[PDB]
Amino acid sequence: YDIQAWKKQCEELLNLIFQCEDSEPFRQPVDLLEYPDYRDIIDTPMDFATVRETLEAGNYESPMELCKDVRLIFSNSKAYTPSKRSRIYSMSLRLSAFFEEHISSVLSDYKSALRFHKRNTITKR
């Protein structure tokens, strides 16, 4: 029932993602000189260095907010790919399955800790 435990769990999961070869295209913002039509397709860029910096700054309030920004990395790759058989999109699907497998217990534990805190609210003092 530790309400704060999610933060270190997300730092460790981000460490595993940065060691995965499949994350290399997603570690830093897309290079607009290499992909000049990227911002004609994609409204909101996102990358794993931005996610880690936001976490380490203390600018996520919950693991649900981190999970929304990681899912945006994957939805941007699906929107920019010219083919569902492309190299970089194929890497995004494998990394998305690994992330979803690991984030599910982080989210469940956080939500369980908040419910336990609300069961024990103090009203008489």
Ligand X SMILES: CNC(=O)c1cnn(C)c1Cl
Q: Among all chains, which residue has been given the structure tokens 């103090």?
A: 122
Report the alpha-carbon distance of residue 91 to residue 25 in Å, rounded: 9
CB of 74 to ligand X, least distance (A): 9
Report the alpha-carbon distance of residue 16 to residue 3 in Å, rounded: 23
Does position 45 interact with ligand X (CB under 6 A)? The reply is no
Report the alpha-carbon distance of residue 85 to residue 93 in Å, rounded: 11
Q: Which stretch binds ligand X (CB under 6 A): 15-23, 56-64, 85-93, 107-115?
A: 85-93
Does position 93 interact with ligand X (CB under 6 A)? The reply is no
Which residue stretches of the chain are H helix?
Answer: 6-19, 38-41, 48-56, 63-80, 87-119
Does position 99 interact with ligand X (CB under 6 A)? The reply is no
What six digits make up the tokens of 105? Answer: 């217990």
CB of 21 to ligand X, least distance (A): 14
Q: Which stretch binds ligand X (CB under 6 A): 15-23, 57-65, 82-90, 95-103?
A: 82-90
Q: Treating both helix axes as pointing N-terminal to C-terminal, what angle do 87-119 and 6-19 enclose, rounded to 10 degrees?
A: 170
Nearer to ligand X, 8 or 94 (CB): 94
Nearer to ligand X, 1 or 35 (CB): 35
Which residues contact ligand X by CB under 6 A? 25-26, 30, 35, 77, 80-81, 86, 88-89
